[PDB]
Amino acid sequence: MKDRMKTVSVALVLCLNVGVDPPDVVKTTPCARLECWIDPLSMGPQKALETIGANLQKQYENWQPRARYKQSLDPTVDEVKKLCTSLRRNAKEERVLFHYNGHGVPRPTVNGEVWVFNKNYTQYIPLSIYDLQTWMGSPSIFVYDCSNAGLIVKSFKQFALQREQELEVSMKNCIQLAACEATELLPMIPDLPADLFTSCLTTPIKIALRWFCMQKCVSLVPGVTLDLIEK
Amino acid sequence: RNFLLAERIMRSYNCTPVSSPRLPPTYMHAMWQAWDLAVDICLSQLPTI
Amino acid sequence: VGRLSSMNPAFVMPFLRKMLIQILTELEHSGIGRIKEQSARMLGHLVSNAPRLIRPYMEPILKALILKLKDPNPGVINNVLATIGELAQVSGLEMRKW
Amino acid sequence: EMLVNMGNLPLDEFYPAVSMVALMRIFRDQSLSHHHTMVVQAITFIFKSLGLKCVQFLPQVMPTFLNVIRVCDGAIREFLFQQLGMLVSFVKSHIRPYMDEIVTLMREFWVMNTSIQSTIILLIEQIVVALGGEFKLYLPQLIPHMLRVFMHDNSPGRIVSIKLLAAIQLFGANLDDYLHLLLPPIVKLF
Amino acid sequence: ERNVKGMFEVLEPLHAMMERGPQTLKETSFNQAYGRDLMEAQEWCRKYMKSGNVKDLTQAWDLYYHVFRRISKQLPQLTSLELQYVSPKLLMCRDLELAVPG
Numbered sequence: 001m002k003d004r005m006k007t008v009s010v011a012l013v014l015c016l017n018v019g020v021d022p023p024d025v026v027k028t029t030p031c032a033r034l035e036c037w038i039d040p041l042s043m044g045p046q047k048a049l050e051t052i053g054a055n056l057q058k059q060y061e062n063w064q065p066r067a068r069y070k071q072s073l074d075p076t077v078d079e080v081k082k083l084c085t086s087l088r089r090n091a092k093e094e095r096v097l098f099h100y101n102g103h104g105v106p107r108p109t110v111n112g113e114v115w116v117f118n119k120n121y122t123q124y125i126p127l128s129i130y131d132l133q134t135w136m137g138s139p140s141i142f143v144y145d146c147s148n149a150g151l152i153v154k155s156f157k158q159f160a161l162q163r164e165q166e167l168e169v170s171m172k173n174c175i176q177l178a179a180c181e182a183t184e185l186l187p188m189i190p191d192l193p194a195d196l197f198t199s200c201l202t203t204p205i206k207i208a209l210r211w212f213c214m215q216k217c218v219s220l221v222p223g224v225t226l227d228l229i230e231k
Numbered sequence: 232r233n234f235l236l237a238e239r240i241m242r243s244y245n246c247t248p249v250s251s252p253r254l255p256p257t258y259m260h261a262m263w264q265a266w267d268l269a270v271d272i273c274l275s276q277l278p279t280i
Numbered sequence: 281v282g283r284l285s286s287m288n289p290a291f292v293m294p295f296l297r298k299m300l301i302q303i304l305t306e307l308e309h310s311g312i313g314r315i316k317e318q319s320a321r322m323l324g325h326l327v328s329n330a331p332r333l334i335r336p337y338m339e340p341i342l343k344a345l346i347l348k349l350k351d352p353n354p355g356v357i358n359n360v361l362a363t364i365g366e367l368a369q370v371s372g373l374e375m376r377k378w
Numbered sequence: 379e380m381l382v383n384m385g386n387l388p389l390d391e392f393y394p395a396v397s398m399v400a401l402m403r404i405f406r407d408q409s410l411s412h413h414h415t416m417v418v419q420a421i422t423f424i425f426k427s428l429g430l431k432c433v434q435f436l437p438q439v440m441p442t443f444l445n446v447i448r449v450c451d452g453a454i455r456e457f458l459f460q461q462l463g464m465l466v467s468f469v470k471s472h473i474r475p476y477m478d479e480i481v482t483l484m485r486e487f488w489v490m491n492t493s494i495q496s497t498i499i500l501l502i503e504q505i506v507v508a509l510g511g512e513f514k515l516y517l518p519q520l521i522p523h524m525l526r527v528f529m530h531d532n533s534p535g536r537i538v539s540i541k542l543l544a545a546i547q548l549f550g551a552n553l554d555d556y557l558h559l560l561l562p563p564i565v566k567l568f
Numbered sequence: 569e570r571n572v573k574g575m576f577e578v579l580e581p582l583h584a585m586m587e588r589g590p591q592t593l594k595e596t597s598f599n600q601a602y603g604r605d606l607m608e609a610q611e612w613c614r615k616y617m618k619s620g621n622v623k624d625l626t627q628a629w630d631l632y633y634h635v636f637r638r639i640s641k642q643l644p645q646l647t648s649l650e651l652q653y654v655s656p657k658l659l660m661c662r663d664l665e666l667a668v669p670g
Contacts, residue, residue, distance in 0.1 A: 150249055176251035187244050200237040211240050220337035223278030244511040264294035302558050311522040
């Protein structure tokens, strides 16, 4: 076997605007709240926004530490440009890891865009996704933890087809993982970690056990509780 | 590898997560029941351990 | 399959386990005589044919059987009685509580 | 309470809020046995006109409405279930905590009767699209009415069973454990 | 020039009364989240207490200024506190041999 392009680094464009409800949503008291098994509501608000970024990196380091990490907190287009282009410039043929979360940030647009500027008010911003399409034109991977990720993937095909409609003068080798299909919207059952797709891609065992213990309707082993599968 | 585990839980709920390449479905496969037996065997003991 | 359970466990064992939960669910939520009766029959029929499989989680089977005895064609109670008989015969010392 | 209530508020909210409070005193009384349609349809129209902005009235309205339904005279209680349906499709996930009682009413009042059958066979689908995954906790409470009537519906061509044959298609993943119970009655029918 | 009143009297007894007390009968590690930088300033303070070397003084103070500046941003924005994290024996007593407080 020949090819050994490893990974460059993880973008961790952790767009959360902690505590600010993206006005699309209405919660309920029984709310899905946890992310990377931390609750920000019961923690130091603007401080804890750093902690989760380091936590997520340390989980990815279990799956591979021989590649880098920038913890990118509510970044505006300029911040995004700096993050992605600097890392890509260090190694071009190597795999970049695009990773995102769509929190304190409304649903993605029909044309694949985002909602952050100077952490002002969940501020609409064009994501420069059709430029990212050459920043990621050489090998990369993408993860989209958001309420309509299949829309991001579909629109990525429409922009990639617009790249073809120039290239007529690597369409997408690069990997993509979508937390739901375009039509869907994420669950709100409080028994779920909120970053569920990431939480699976990052900590499958905790998920599997915490899923498992709820599912059946007579517990053929009856002694088990949440409390023990922690231990 | 974790993506297949995701496909299971997501189809438990109302999600159908999707991939760059055009994968065939997996959620049904008999080997999953081998997983679930292995967990039950394990967690039969843990209430004493 | 009850018999072959000692030979090639990797295919057989899990498959059987899936049946067991499906049959307890049926026994728990069936409203019909015919299905309740067949449920209890198939359970009883299985236990002694692959006994090693029931040892590890007898107790909720037994609790369900008690609750079927406790409150009502008598054929359903007859099959549950026959099943207690087989179960105790397999179980041995484990039985002492009930 | 009005001078307190008015004394607290920006204008917009106190219009529907005073409308709600005004109606709720009648809602708590036997005179409702006359004005039922009026009060109920008024609520419906107000919730319809508000969406996100009537969730705040659930804690008063809903437990009162359940008490009304379980007290109500059958020939108009039949009608209340349609109204509860439309209240649910406005309210969505926020219905959660009452669901135990709502399912209990559907347990208590389901028999060979055509109008109860057809209205409840509809009502289900609102509960389903509100509880798109969650509904499973309640499905086993309802399998015991479904299996019976699926194989005893006296109507010409088992017509409410033909409506149930569509209704079943909604359930998708949340049906998954119980397919083993539900399939064979369909196989006999075709 | 009234040196004793601040550094000697307050600052080592302070850190000793973090190290027993809230490093045990409160959640050790997160109370030690301040305590572990208060500790590195405390070493320089303990050096100064006995030495009288005016370098140990300015080291102790600058380190203390840094953790003080961390603390200065967080005293303004703690508000509601989980009672067993307030003390792990607190919250946990129930249905007592006591009438309600006087």
